[PDB]
Write a protein that binds this ligand. Sequence first.
Ligand SMILES: *[C@@H]1O[C@H](CO)[C@@H](O[C@@H]2O[C@H](CO)[C@@H](O)[C@H](O)[C@H]2NC(C)=O)[C@H](O)[C@H]1NC(C)=O
Ligand SMILES: *[C@@H]1O[C@H](CO)[C@@H](O[C@@H]2O[C@H](CO)[C@@H](O)[C@H](O)[C@H]2NC(C)=O)[C@H](O)[C@H]1NC(C)=O
Ligand SMILES: *[C@@H]1O[C@H](CO)[C@@H](O[C@@H]2O[C@H](CO)[C@@H](O)[C@H](O)[C@H]2NC(C)=O)[C@H](O)[C@H]1NC(C)=O
Ligand SMILES: *[C@@H]1O[C@H](CO)[C@@H](O[C@@H]2O[C@H](CO)[C@@H](O)[C@H](O)[C@H]2NC(C)=O)[C@H](O)[C@H]1NC(C)=O
Ligand SMILES: CC(C)Cn1cnc2c(N)nc3ccccc3c21
Ligand SMILES: CC(C)Cn1cnc2c(N)nc3ccccc3c21
Ligand SMILES: *[C@@H]1O[C@H](CO)[C@@H](O)[C@H](O)[C@H]1NC(C)=O
Ligand SMILES: *[C@@H]1O[C@H](CO)[C@@H](O)[C@H](O)[C@H]1NC(C)=O
Ligand SMILES: *[C@@H]1O[C@H](CO)[C@@H](O)[C@H](O)[C@H]1NC(C)=O
Ligand SMILES: *[C@@H]1O[C@H](CO)[C@@H](O)[C@H](O)[C@H]1NC(C)=O
Ligand SMILES: *[C@@H]1O[C@H](CO)[C@@H](O)[C@H](O)[C@H]1NC(C)=O
Ligand SMILES: *[C@@H]1O[C@H](CO)[C@@H](O)[C@H](O)[C@H]1NC(C)=O
Ligand SMILES: *[C@@H]1O[C@H](CO)[C@@H](O)[C@H](O)[C@H]1NC(C)=O
Ligand SMILES: *[C@@H]1O[C@H](CO)[C@@H](O)[C@H](O)[C@H]1NC(C)=O
Ligand SMILES: *[C@@H]1O[C@H](CO)[C@@H](O)[C@H](O)[C@H]1NC(C)=O
Ligand SMILES: *[C@@H]1O[C@H](CO)[C@@H](O)[C@H](O)[C@H]1NC(C)=O
Lengths: 772, 772
Amino acid sequence: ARWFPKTLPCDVTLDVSKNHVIVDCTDKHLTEIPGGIPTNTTNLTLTINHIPDISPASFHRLVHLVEIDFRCNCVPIRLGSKSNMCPRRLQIKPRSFSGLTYLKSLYLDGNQLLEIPQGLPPSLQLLSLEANNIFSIRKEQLTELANIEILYLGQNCYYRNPCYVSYSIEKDAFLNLTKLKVLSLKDNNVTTVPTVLPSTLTELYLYNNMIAEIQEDDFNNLNQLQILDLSGNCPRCYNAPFPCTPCKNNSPLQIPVNAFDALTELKVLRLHSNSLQHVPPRWFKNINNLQELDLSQNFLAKEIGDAKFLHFLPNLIQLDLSFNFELQVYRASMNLSQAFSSLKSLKILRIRGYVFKELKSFQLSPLHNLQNLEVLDLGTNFIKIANLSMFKQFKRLKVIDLSVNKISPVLEQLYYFRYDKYARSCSCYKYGQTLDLSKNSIFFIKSSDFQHLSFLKCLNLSGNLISQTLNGSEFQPLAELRYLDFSNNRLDLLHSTAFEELRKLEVLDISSNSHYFQSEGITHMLNFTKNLKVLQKLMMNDNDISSSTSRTMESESLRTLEFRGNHLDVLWRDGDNRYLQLFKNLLKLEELDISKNSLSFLPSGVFDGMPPNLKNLSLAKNGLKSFIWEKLRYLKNLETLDLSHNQLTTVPERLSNCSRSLKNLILKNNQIRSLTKYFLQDAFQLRYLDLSSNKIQMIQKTSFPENVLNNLKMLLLHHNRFLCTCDAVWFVWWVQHTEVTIPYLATDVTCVGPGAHKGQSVISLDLYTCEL
Amino acid sequence: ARWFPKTLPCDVTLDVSKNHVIVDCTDKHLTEIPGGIPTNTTNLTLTINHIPDISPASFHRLVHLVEIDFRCNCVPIRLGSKSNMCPRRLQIKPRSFSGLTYLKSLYLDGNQLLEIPQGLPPSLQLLSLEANNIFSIRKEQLTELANIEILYLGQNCYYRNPCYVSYSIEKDAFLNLTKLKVLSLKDNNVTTVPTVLPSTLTELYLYNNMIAEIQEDDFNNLNQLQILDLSGNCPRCYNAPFPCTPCKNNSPLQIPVNAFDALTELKVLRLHSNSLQHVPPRWFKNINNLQELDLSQNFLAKEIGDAKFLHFLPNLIQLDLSFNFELQVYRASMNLSQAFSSLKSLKILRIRGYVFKELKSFQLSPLHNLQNLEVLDLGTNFIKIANLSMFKQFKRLKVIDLSVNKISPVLEQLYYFRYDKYARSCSCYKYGQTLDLSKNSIFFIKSSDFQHLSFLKCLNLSGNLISQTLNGSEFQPLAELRYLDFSNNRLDLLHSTAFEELRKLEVLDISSNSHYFQSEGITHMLNFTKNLKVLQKLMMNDNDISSSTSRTMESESLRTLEFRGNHLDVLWRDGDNRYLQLFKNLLKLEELDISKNSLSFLPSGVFDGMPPNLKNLSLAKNGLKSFIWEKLRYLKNLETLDLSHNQLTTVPERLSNCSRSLKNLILKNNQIRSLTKYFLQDAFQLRYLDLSSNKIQMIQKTSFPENVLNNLKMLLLHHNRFLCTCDAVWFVWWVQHTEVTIPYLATDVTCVGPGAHKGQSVISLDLYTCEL
Ligand SMILES: *[C@@H]1O[C@H](CO)[C@@H](O[C@@H]2O[C@H](CO)[C@@H](O)[C@H](O)[C@H]2NC(C)=O)[C@H](O)[C@H]1NC(C)=O
Ligand SMILES: *[C@@H]1O[C@H](CO)[C@@H](O[C@@H]2O[C@H](CO)[C@@H](O)[C@H](O)[C@H]2NC(C)=O)[C@H](O)[C@H]1NC(C)=O
Ligand SMILES: *[C@@H]1O[C@H](CO)[C@@H](O[C@@H]2O[C@H](CO)[C@@H](O)[C@H](O)[C@H]2NC(C)=O)[C@H](O)[C@H]1NC(C)=O
Ligand SMILES: *[C@@H]1O[C@H](CO)[C@@H](O[C@@H]2O[C@H](CO)[C@@H](O)[C@H](O)[C@H]2NC(C)=O)[C@H](O)[C@H]1NC(C)=O
Ligand SMILES: CC(C)Cn1cnc2c(N)nc3ccccc3c21
Ligand SMILES: CC(C)Cn1cnc2c(N)nc3ccccc3c21
Ligand SMILES: *[C@@H]1O[C@H](CO)[C@@H](O)[C@H](O)[C@H]1NC(C)=O
Ligand SMILES: *[C@@H]1O[C@H](CO)[C@@H](O)[C@H](O)[C@H]1NC(C)=O
Ligand SMILES: *[C@@H]1O[C@H](CO)[C@@H](O)[C@H](O)[C@H]1NC(C)=O
Ligand SMILES: *[C@@H]1O[C@H](CO)[C@@H](O)[C@H](O)[C@H]1NC(C)=O
Ligand SMILES: *[C@@H]1O[C@H](CO)[C@@H](O)[C@H](O)[C@H]1NC(C)=O
Ligand SMILES: *[C@@H]1O[C@H](CO)[C@@H](O)[C@H](O)[C@H]1NC(C)=O
Ligand SMILES: *[C@@H]1O[C@H](CO)[C@@H](O)[C@H](O)[C@H]1NC(C)=O
Ligand SMILES: *[C@@H]1O[C@H](CO)[C@@H](O)[C@H](O)[C@H]1NC(C)=O
Ligand SMILES: *[C@@H]1O[C@H](CO)[C@@H](O)[C@H](O)[C@H]1NC(C)=O
Ligand SMILES: *[C@@H]1O[C@H](CO)[C@@H](O)[C@H](O)[C@H]1NC(C)=O
């Protein structure tokens, strides 16, 4: 199919429209730039390899390069692998880039460089030097960068990459970079705002440094600035998950009342973790276009009840006041200033970590007439008491977030506390109004708890303490509910009328309610589904279900059932036929996950007991030691079969004689050592085949006919035991010449032998002696 | 060291005192009896193999045999592996056993035999034929068994091994077995008690059959009988986890009032799952020595409130009345008859599954003066209300079991519901008075909850809903408490005074309290240990701990810390030195488990931060990719190092130069491919070395010096990648001739190559061609 097999260990992609030739050698275990990169290459990515040096020979023929991504070939020791440490910093020889007349972007992050590389072409718009060892910026070193527009210099001096001195920037070092728009000096041990800066700047990142004072006029000329981040200067260090040294005398970052006067275009101001005790209104007197303000992790508890500065922010969209609580103070309630009611445009208000015992509707009245409010986040406040009915006045909201509180009758998990949330590396909301009570202490629910909440579309009760026999009465007011997350509670399914009052329920998650399923004698009614007439998806994963009082689950509507992490092996004990049709009467079911059910064999009758429209079946991670492939004929609509992570040793003699319809067959991580003589013969709408991580030694053409192999969208063969003898001549030739996508050819499709060929890639194999 | 290497694939043990030669071939994948079994063999075990037949040649020379254990060489299909099903039943040719003049015990269970084997020697005392296909007993087939004392014939006709007809026993089939003492016909589809049985019987097992009625004279001559089990005849089928057919019209097994009159020696009566509604006192009129009575899984709920039969049971030790509740009835309280107070000798009372809402002190008053009572089990009763102070009247008890209830302000997991709890296969009580409240709904505790319980030595609160900041006040009355199981709650360690009122506490289990450790911003005081002055063992596994407000844990008493399943990889993030001494001030710590902490590397400072008397350290299951063995020099008292299940690839050049104290080194399941030249040179304190499940190809003599191998109690080498070429001549010869204990030589110490030798045991390898 190809006359010239591709031997380059990089992925090569073509974008005709933009005339781009994309060569991606990410994580190919290279120790040298590979030979034979196409001369027309425009984008070359060499990230995460161990190439030790760059030189004029490196990109000699690649004169059309617009981008070189050469990140992390020598990452600082504390940031990189300790098993394969980089022995010596990257070496860049003179004139390696000067011939790259079209070069627009150069990423050299994470290479332990000591200086800004010189000789850079004047076409360059973007230079990235994060996580190097450059901590002195001099003007001579920047003249080469006359046309630069984006400059990343951060993470060159901080606790994961120390330089042991203060960062140094020469007076006016950046001022003649007349096109510079984005400057990032974060995580750098910087002590003063550099001046004077070019007035073209749109974004200035100065966060996580040692700046104790802003001068008057530090930002005097930046009338185009749109984003300013001064966070983490004078940090709030309590419970910090990184080594944290506060400014002396409990001092805040000191910002003169007029410091932002010039910033008329400012849209985002981030003052997270600056130990602020007051927010002077004067700050915002000539900023009228501000949309995003981050004041989290300061000491603004007393200020939130006053907050006169809010009157100057009628265009604010997002306000974050999280984690401003006074240490060791557990306030009785939340005191929001009336000034909040002047925030016409506010869509998102986050006030986590205010820390108070009781939320009362009257406390939220300053927010009552904010017409655009979409998210109210009061998580992580240790609230013990909240009458949920108070949110009848907030029907317009999209998300009411009370996650992680102590109530009883999506941001990253580390978000407010991590060092740099933007560090670069080498859900039910869509259903409508959402009330998030997850991770609270709700141990008993009753209908009155939800009075005036009929508008709710998604209720998250995950991770409460609900240990109750639901009888269909607990959720009466929730007439519109489409999504209920009940996971990680202690559901007791004594009554099959559980949940039946949620008449519009489409998704139900009762996963990780294993508690009552773990003790003998307790009754479980798994047929509670019959009464839910629009239920589309049911998740009951990790419930340890090993017994059921009812012998059939019933639904006219269910399409998806997740049943992972249960004990169907016990339910289907050989000789007990009573539960072999447990899923048979789920007549619209198309997807069934019964992985992780300890099913070491499938009793005969399982496949005949499947519902008729089953499309996606997972039997993964079952320790399956044998499989009667012929029984798949019962599954007349089957299109995806996931048998991964089992102990299978054979494939069917004729996949065409087992499942005529099957499109995706996943057999990775089994014990298959050979294929049947005619395995894929006539399997014409097979499209995806994963045989990776098995023990296959040889494959012959009869098992792998081309009538099927090139209608394959992907064929996975890596991590097997291929024997590269003269018997493998067809397989080797086909792999070398095929158009079919086979991942990891450059890295993990390898001969195990014989001898000379051990560890050699099949792509590089020369078997001419077989043809002498 | 040996002149004649052992090639027999069986373990051979010598007991000089008992004149026994024990040959154990259990599960050796044998398809024939091996040649060369010692002529002096007295005990030969061939269980779980695939030997298809027995013949006079089988034991031809083994005339001293006293026991043959030939179980499970052809298991019934539903009971056996479905990947290696037995193709044909065991074949026994005539006179295979008649020469075995000393044979006392013959186990032929699970071989699909169709008849009682004939030709057995008259020495035979024990014959076991369970899980065969023998379902008609004729007197002629039993004549060979004149001296038999123990006869196991059950599991020959039941749902896991059907015969599709009723069991048949000829009239008086057993009567001329004049020495018969133990007869078991369980799980056999038996329809009547066989009569007449020999009066020498001491134990009669008739359980799990289809006996609907006992005749008044069925047991008339059994004046020596000590154990009678009639359970599972007319079973109680509600929630049965096995196919269960009840007697018609809800009838119980029906037992005339005088059916037990002859059984004056009876000590054990088992009537579990007989659908009994009454226990007539007349049953026990001539039974005065009964010690154990099982009446579980009947319908005796109302009888328990009357129970006149108990007046005839003054010598009873154990009484089981569990799971007698009326279906769909949730009683208000438990009604124990006053007759219970006549149970003078009772030690154990189990009344699980009575099902009632409220336990009150007065309900237990019939038990108040049972002086010998040790165990009171009221688990699995859905009790909602119980004042724990009532157990001040029960200080003499060893265990008060309220496990699995619904209280709010050790038997196998399947026990009462499994089909045959005696089916054969092919904890804090020791601290003193124990109150087991595990798996209840306790969400809040206060000191008054434990008023008058100061005598308690162990409290099990595992698996409640306790989501509370303990401050040292919640357990004040528990002045004698030595063991607290607080696992699987939601401990909030805000205060370092948590648990300090438990002044005699020696063991604390706060494992699986990960809830509050999983959300950022929450304060956790890990230094709460300082206040527990006799605390010996702390378990805090599976807490997901990744942050700590305190930097050091402190204790003058702690000897064992389990810290498995946390995130020390995050706590010890490279460049953050603040927690590197977390354990340093546990000055008496001898055992530390920090397995499963995602430690892919160990930051420098970890080993210097360890406390000085550490002896047993586990770093297992960490994904460890590298290890600086020299740092072990800091651990001057280290004796056990568990590095199993990691990704290590090398051993130290000289282990002796890394640790002078190390005795036990566990390296199993790593990626080691070779040993260093002088690995064990002069490692004189080494006693135990596990290298199994690595990728080792070759071992040379320099690595394994003889003066070290001679002190090894065990050296594990199985499941490596041994290359059996002429380069391996020393290793192969040494393995064949050494006295060092090496497990699995017969099964899993194998050549992977070259070619011809693939899969061959190295013990069987002949390398003479290397020496021509
Ligand atoms: C190839 O390199 C060019 C040059 O850097 C990339 O072009 C940039 O793409 C981003 C994506 O929106 C734009 O925001 C930048 O403005 C572009 N810069 C220039 C100078 O054009 C291009 O994305 C790269 N393509 C691939 C597939 O890697
Ligand atoms: C940031 O700069 C400070 C100096 O401003 C560095 O601190 C010095 O470190 C040296 C060597 O570690 C000490 O001898 C000095 O006493 C320190 N000076 C002060 C004022 O503390 C610090 O190491 C730098 N931070 C990083 C992460 O490199
Ligand atoms: C070897 O076989 C003999 C005879 O079967 C075993 O001796 C019996 O051991 C049980 C176990 O306690 C005793 O109750 C019996 O009284 C013993 N004698 C008989 C005739 O059964 C002996 O235990 C076996 N040894 C081993 C190591 O398996
Ligand atoms: C126990 O014995 C009964 C008969 O006493 C067996 O039941 C018969 O089974 C055959 C074959 O399935 C049926 O055609 C008969 O109608 C059954 N008779 C009755 C009275 O039910 C039963 O199969 C046996 N049980 C086992 C496990 O072998
Ligand atoms: C059928 C009842 C008489 C006993 N019972 C059996 N299963 C259950 C169960 N899951 N929850 C319960 C909760 C309260 C009371 C009884 C039960 C119960
Ligand atoms: C110290 C408080 C100002 C805030 N706080 C910080 N960590 C915690 C914590 N684990 N549990 C709590 C329980 C109730 C109230 C506050 C907290 C709390
Ligand atoms: C709320 O806090 C503000 C700010 O100090 C204060 O002026 C006001 O009195 C407080 N109101 C209440 C009800 O606590
Ligand atoms: C909660 O507030 C609602 C008002 O919407 C009221 O009807 C209800 O009684 C309140 N519940 C409690 C427990 O105060
Ligand atoms: C509910 O909350 C839990 C825990 O906070 C979260 O993991 C889960 O994804 C949420 N459920 C939905 C449906 O968004
Ligand atoms: C579920 O099945 C059981 C049969 O075991 C029956 O008692 C119960 O009424 C059924 N419930 C529904 C809703 O069908
Ligand atoms: C307990 O039940 C028995 C059985 O009928 C009855 O005779 C007795 O009066 C009951 N006692 C109490 C206190 O309920
Ligand atoms: C529990 O019983 C004790 C008597 O031993 C009594 O002092 C206490 O008040 C009772 N507690 C409750 C809540 O009834
Ligand atoms: C406490 O009870 C739990 C749950 O039944 C059990 O797993 C655990 O072993 C018990 N703890 C002790 C110390 O006996
Ligand atoms: C500890 O908590 C209990 C109940 O929350 C309270 O009665 C007691 O005063 C507290 N003790 C201290 C020292 O705070
Ligand atoms: C635990 O550590 C915290 C801060 O690290 C300290 O305030 C507290 O007093 C300590 N408690 C004990 C018992 O050492
Ligand atoms: C390790 O070996 C070297 C060379 O024999 C020796 O100098 C050194 O002291 C040894 N270290 C230990 C801890 O035994």
